[PDB]
Amino acid sequence: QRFERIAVQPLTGVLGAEITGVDLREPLDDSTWNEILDAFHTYQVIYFPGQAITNEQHIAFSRRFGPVDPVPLLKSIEGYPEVQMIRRIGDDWHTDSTFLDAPPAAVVMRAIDVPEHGGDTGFLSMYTAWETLSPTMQATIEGLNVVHSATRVFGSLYQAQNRMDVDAGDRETVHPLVVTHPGSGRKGLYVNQVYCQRIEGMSEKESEPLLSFLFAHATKPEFTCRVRWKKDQVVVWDNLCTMHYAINDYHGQTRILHRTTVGGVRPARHHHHH
Amino acid sequence: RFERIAVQPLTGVLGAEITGVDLREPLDDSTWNEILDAFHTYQVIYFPGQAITNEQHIAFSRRFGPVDPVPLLKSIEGYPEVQMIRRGDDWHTDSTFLDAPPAAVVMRAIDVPEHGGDTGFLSMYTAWETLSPTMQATIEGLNVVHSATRVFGSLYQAQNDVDAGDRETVHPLVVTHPGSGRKGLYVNQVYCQRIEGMSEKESEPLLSFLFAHATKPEFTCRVRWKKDQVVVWDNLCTMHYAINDYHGQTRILHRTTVGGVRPARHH
Amino acid sequence: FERIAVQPLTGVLGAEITGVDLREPLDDSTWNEILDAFHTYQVIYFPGQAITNEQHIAFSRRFGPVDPVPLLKSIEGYPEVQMIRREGDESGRVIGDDWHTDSTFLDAPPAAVVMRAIDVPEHGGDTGFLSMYTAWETLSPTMQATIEGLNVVHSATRVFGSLYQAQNRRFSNTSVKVMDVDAGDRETVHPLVVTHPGSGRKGLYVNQVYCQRIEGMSEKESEPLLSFLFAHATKPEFTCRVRWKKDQVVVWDNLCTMHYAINDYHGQTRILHRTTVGGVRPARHHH
Amino acid sequence: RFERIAVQPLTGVLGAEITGVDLREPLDDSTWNEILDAFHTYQVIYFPGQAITNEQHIAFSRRFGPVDPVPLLKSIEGYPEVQMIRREGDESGRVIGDDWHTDSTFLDAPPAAVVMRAIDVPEHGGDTGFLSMYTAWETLSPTMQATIEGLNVVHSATRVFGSLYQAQNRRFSNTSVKVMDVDAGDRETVHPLVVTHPGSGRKGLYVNQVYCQRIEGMSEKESEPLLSFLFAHATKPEFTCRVRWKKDQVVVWDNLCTMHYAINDYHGQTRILHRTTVGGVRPARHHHH
Ligand SMILES: O=C(O)CCC(=O)C(=O)O
Ligand SMILES: O=C(O)CCC(=O)C(=O)O
Ligand SMILES: O=C(O)CCC(=O)C(=O)O
Ligand SMILES: O=C(O)CCC(=O)C(=O)O
Ligand SMILES: [Co+2]
Ligand SMILES: [Co+2]
Ligand SMILES: [Co+2]
Ligand SMILES: [Co+2]
């Protein structure tokens, strides 16, 4: 499509794009914002090189995407509670915090101090993962829901490795296996190995073959892109329709990023129509 | 509840010993109906001590459904419905690559080892019934492509009539038994290739899960063969497994096949 | 066999022993034949043996000293005799319904178990057995050479340790003692391949209930090999199936067999009494 | 380290951009030695702005070893040593190399290296994944390493152009691919599971899903779990890099210690690259007896 106010360079044939010709230190006019939002909706993960911005500017940019909440979480930046420090879940493919009834809609991350080489982030499209399934596979699983919890990350199953709050780790939520993105209207797969326990109404054993197949299917290299971080890069990813993977190939070097979270609504099959 | 025969179940899931009946003789209606009841309930049934003839084996078989005049290479001379079986070891049921596989098989031990050569059986009713309602609802409408390609078609030839080996048929994943009215799972690793409409990759995890689920020991029984034992198994709602632990000994049985109707979800 | 009658159950393992009265002391010649049959057939059963507790204990003592198993409740009056019991009304976890051999989380697991039917269903409640000699002997020479030197980490974590506590499938108070979680998590290491101290034969020694990983490997590294061995050892042709009749006594070798409890008797009482004979540390050689 | 070339590593595991060199020209000894160093270290190297001709591509290739064309691929027009990787705008058939593999491991002596040049490539799309089998090997536990180091693996082309290929329906186009012999597709060779690179002296894992059939001496059932585990382990994203192609980019990869993966995310566009293959020696555990 046509971009007049920004320059967009797609990273692959599936997802990811470099956005230039904008200064995120400044407020964005309506026309420029609308192009950024349509690039976000199309490309699903977008990155802005060369944006030496402040905390308030990071927060204000984030707010264009949706609400960002006065969080004061343990890793909140002092004086700027909407920004968290990320200093280095992780190295399995996932999307963030799917154990919540309403996970983030997006995340906006800024490199503060990063390696010259190493520390890439993989991304993939769950739209493409869904669309490459056969019509029969689609019809078979489209109505299923999946139980998500943090039990293997900070709940009882985690604790039971022998060598946050445990109740909060164990609390289950249920999301559709196939979700409709509230902004693009597109269907995407919604499952991940970090937080998904089982299909709602099935046993774990019953669920395992299907979940394992979907994990392997979604993560084929051709559904993926790889983002390199440079100092002052801003990355925004769609937390509903992508998954990501943190690459730890920079042993012994400092990696510091700041993060804001944009709030979403309950993942759903639709937002009041089909 | 059985007045004309004596029935001793082999396990809590399937299999039963039937005594108090002489298969040399014609069966009156009341006795036949009890045998058919026992067959429908226990799914694999065995009659010890039945020193019968070929025509008697054939006539007993005909009570279950049609048995076809057509000889095979292994037909007994003079008795083309009876075949000699002389000696499998994956769980299967027979000939599911056909549009209409056998409904049942009636096998008679002629000369068999004193120990060794058991046959495992399992119930696909119980395999189906131990799946959660949600798993059931999710897969009940699927159909499965069966062929003999890995037994005597192109895939077999590539690792070791080929057109007949490759010919595909489709059966429901879940079938209703035409006599009992019960639903059972219908899949096996020997002949099932993929789920109709799905790729192989899509299909394999679900098929492998169902194969592993159906073959848990508690869904199973084990039949020992004795001279003159007659065994009948339901070829739709059971699977079986040939145990080869009798290296170097003669094992001869006779078999008749009872014809069935196309496996289906409803009649 | 001159003193006993032995009827093998299959071509791989299992035999019926008759012509013996276990109410009586056994002369040397008869005992030696029973031991021969045990070593050969690996699981042996004696049909019509309406014996008392002292007699069960005395028969057990011929195999080795009595060393009770941690998890099971003792019968009233006899600490060496333990229950396997399930009630008509019970719906909780069934004791033994994955392939295993007993208590492999111990440094020195039982050598053998002698179990007697007290009150059992007319049909239902069989026990599966398999031979780990045969499991080992059907591996290719190259597979054998590849894994013969490996050891395996065993623990009870999924039965009464932290992983058990973390899940919902729960044992009944009926046959099973209250237990310590640290003792459930405690690791022991055994060889993957063991030499039976009585027969001198090599057998595979791994089971899905108690084995966590191969010593020195990660769980991920271990899983393919362990899963392959579990599937390989449990093929039906390596197996037999024992039916219980009232007063049948069964003896199994706890080192070279595995067993499987079949629960196809929902709604019926099943009671058996059991004595456990102590063994020594599993090892690759006894020289 | 580098005085004659500029080297920019792509990731912390493998891959590097090489600039400050003109591949139209012969390379002096000092410059070649640095390129070879970089190749040995980074395992896949790429040279962005190299509008070279066929003779120059061939002459650069010869610095790595002699030219030994790969069985499957079609030669270009005036040059039998230069082969096409090509997919047309229109094409819907099997894509060349869309499983992780290294090339032609069914040969007793597979290629040591490949040098590939972009002729006409999409503006976005058609990346190639690479990974390091040194790093795959080195992240296995010492005990796992000791357990499998002595195994050998049977390779053949049966699923690419032998009987198993003929028995299935997913078909290559006539476009980049020669008509092939089924017996040659089925012919087995055996390589060690762990190989020593003859130039770097480093051990790397040597297994791939395209050509490996079983472990020598084992049944298929015995072999499958180990091979599947190694395939999954070697292809973790952190062992990988992703190379984007620009027109006139020259890429050289080590065919012994890397694997690669062709990404097909450019449905409806032409992609043409030209390739020369450098011959290598029998993979082996040691080059010192
Ligand atoms: O460090 C990164 O690139 C992203 C890490 C991650 O998994 C997250 O914060 O969601
Ligand atoms: O042991 C048996 O009689 C069953 C033989 C068999 O498996 C077959 O009918 O294909
Ligand atoms: O109940 C049975 O059949 C055997 C249970 C068991 O595993 C045991 O007693 O060790
Ligand atoms: O097309 C590509 O990206 C590489 C394909 C491949 O495997 C090859 O050229 O050997
Ligand atoms: Co994350
Ligand atoms: Co059969
Ligand atoms: Co037990
Ligand atoms: Co290739």
Closest CA–CA distance from residue C151 to any residue of chain D (Å): 11
**What total number of domains does chain B contain?**
1
- How buried is A65 (Cβ within 10 angstroms: 0-12 exposed, 13-18 middle, 19+ buried)? buried
Residue nearest to atom 7 of ligand 2 (CA): B88
The answer on whether D100 is annotated among ligand-binding residues is no
DSSP state of D177: B
Chain D CA closest to residue A18: D124
Specify the ligand 2 atom closest to the Cα of B105.
9
Q: Which residue has the tokens 């795959």?
A: D136
Which of C142, C225, C230 to probe by mutation at the D interface, max D CB count within 10 Å? Answer: C142
Q: Which residues of C are annotated as a binding site for Fe cation?
A: 100, 102, 259
Is there a contact between A156 and C166 if contact means CB atoms under 8 Å apart?
Answer: yes
| Beta carbons of B8 and B20 less than 8 angstroms apart | no
| Ligand 1 contact via A96 beta carbon (within 6 Å) | yes
Radius of gyration of chain C (CA): 18
- For residue A274, how many C-alpha atoms fall within 13 Å in the half-sphere facing its CB? 1
Cα A260 to ligand 1 centre (Å): 12
Measure the N-to-C terminal CA separation of chain C; round to a whole number of Å.
30
Contact C70, C179 (CB under 8 A): yes
Which technique was the structure solved with, according to the deposited record?
X-ray
Closest CA to B254 of B222, B216, B220, B227: B227
Residue span of the structural domain in which D144 resides: 1-289
Query: Are the C-beta atoms of residues D154 and D187 closer than 8 Å to each other?
Result: no
Which residue of D205, D218, D220, D235 to mutate against C (max C Cβ within 10 Å)? D218
Nearest CA to ligand 3 atom 2: C261
Residue C186 annotated to the active site: no
Helices (H), ranges, chain B: 29-42, 54-62, 124-129, 133-139, 149-152, 154-157, 162-166, 200-214
Residue ID of nearest Cα to ligand 1 atom 1: A246
Which residue in D11, D122, D124 is closest to A249 by CB distance? D11
Q: How many CB atoms lie within 10 A of CB B77?
A: 8
Interval between CA B18 and ligand 2 midpoint (Å): 21
Cα–Cα dist B175/B196, whole Å: 15
| Contact between residue D285 and residue D192 where contact means Cβ atoms under 8 Å apart | yes
Q: Kindly state if the Cβ of C121 falls inside 6 Å of ligand 3.
A: no
- Our measurement of the distance from residue C181's CA atom to the centroid of its chain's CA atoms, rounded to an integer in Å, reads 23
Chain A interface residues (partner C, CB cutoff 8 A): 156-157, 159-160, 162
Q: Based on the residue annotation, tell me whether D103 is a catalytic residue of this protein.
A: yes
**SS3 of residue B24 by DSSP:** coil
d(CA A40, CA A23): 17
CATH no. for residue A166? 3.60.130.10
Q: Do D129 and A221 touch (CB under 8 A)?
A: yes
| Sequence-distant (≥ 6) Cβ neighbours of residue C24 within 8 angstroms | none
Strands (E), chain C: 5-8, 15-18, 43-46, 74-75, 78-86, 112-119, 127-131, 151-154, 188-191, 193-195, 202-204, 211-214, 239-242, 249-253, 257-261, 270-277
Suggest the residue from C97, C153, C155, C167 to mutate for an interface test with chain A (most A CBs closer than 10 A): C167
Is residue D63 within 8 Å of D259, Cβ to Cβ? no
Q: Please state, in angstroms and rounded to a whole number, the distance separating the CA atoms of residues B206 and B97.
A: 20
Strand order in the sheet with B75-76: B6-9, B16-19, B44-47, B230-234, B104-111, B252-258, B79-86, B75-76
Distance CA B185, CA D53 (A): 64
Of residues D138, D261, D276, D254, the one with CA closest to residue D197: D254
**C-D interface: how many C-beta pairs under 8 angstroms?**
53
- Cα end-to-end span (Å), chain B: 28
Q: Do C140 and D226 touch (CB under 8 A)?
A: no
Element (H, E) at D178: none
Strand pairing report for C151-154 and C188-191:
antiparallel
Instruction: Cite the beta strand spans of chain A per DSSP E.
Output: 7-10, 17-20, 45-48, 76-77, 80-87, 106-113, 121-125, 145-148, 173-176, 178-180, 187-189, 196-199, 224-227, 234-238, 242-246, 256-262
Between chains, do D226 and C224 touch, taking CB under 8 Å as contact?
A: yes
Q: Which helix (H) or strand (E) holds D19?
A: strand D16-19
Residues in D lying within 8 Å of B, measured between beta carbons: 158, 163-164, 166-167
**In the A/B pair of chains, how many CB contacts fall below 8 A?**
53
Both tokens assigned to D86? 């090509």
Q: Whose CA is nearest to atom 6 of ligand 4?
A: D97
- Contact flag D166-B157 (C-beta cutoff 8 Å): no
Q: Which residues of A touch B199 (CB under 8 A)?
A: 134, 137
Cβ atoms A148, A196 nearer than 8 A? yes
How far, in Å, CA of D87 to CA of D98, rounded?
A: 13
The three-class DSSP label of residue A103 is coil
- The answer to whether C84 touches C252, Cβ cutoff 8 Å, is no
Residue C128's SS3 state is: strand
Q: How far apart are CA B150 and CA B165, in angstroms?
A: 8
One-letter identity of residue D288: H
Tell me: is residue A180 an annotated ligand-binding position.
no
Within 6 A (CB) of ligand 2 lie B 88, 94, 107, 119, 240, 242
Check whether D245 is labelled as a binding-site residue. Answer: yes
Provide the token pair at B139: 């897969």
Distance CA A207, CA A215 (A): 12
For C95, list phi and psi in degrees, rounded to 5: -65, 125
User: Which residues does B contribute to its contact with C (CB < 8 Å)?
Assistant: 8-13, 89, 113, 115-118, 120, 217-218, 221-222, 241, 243-247
CA angle A229, A233, A235 (to 5 degrees): 85
**Diameter over CA atoms, chain D:** 55
This structure's resolution (Å) is: 2.3
Is D101 known to sit in a ligand binding site? Answer: yes
Give how far the C-alpha of residue C179 lies from the chain's centroid of Cα atoms, to the nearest Å: 21
Which tokens is C23 given?
């109410």
Q: C240: which 2 tokens?
A: 């037999």
Query: What is the spatial distance between Cα C137 and Cα C139, in angstroms, rounded to a whole number?
Result: 6
Residues followed by a break in chain A (C to N exceeding 2.5 Å) are: 88, 163
C-alpha dihedral sign at A72, A74, A75, A79: positive
How far is residue B149's CA from residue D160's CA, in Å, rounded to a whole number?
19
Residue D56, SS3 per DSSP: helix
Q: Of all atoms in ligand 1, which is nearest to the CA of residue A90?
A: 7
In contact, A18 and A11? CB cutoff 8 Å: yes
d(CA D44, CA D243): 9
Determine the Cα–Cα distance for residues B56 and B255; give it in Å rounded to an integer: 12
Search chain C and give the residue with CA nearest D225: C224
DSSP one-letter code for B132: -
Q: Does ligand 3 come within 6 angstroms of the Cβ of C70?
A: no
Residues of A known to be catalytic: 94, 96, 244, 259
D115 lines ligand 4 (CB under 6 A): no
Ligand 4 atom nearest the C-alpha of D116 is 9
Structure tokens at C87: 């009630």
Which chain C residues touch A if contact means CB-CB below 8 Å? 157, 162-163, 165-166, 185
Which atom in ligand 2 lies closest to the alpha carbon of residue B95?
10
| Count of other CB atoms within 10 angstroms of residue A72 | 9
Quote the tokens at residue C59: 């028969």
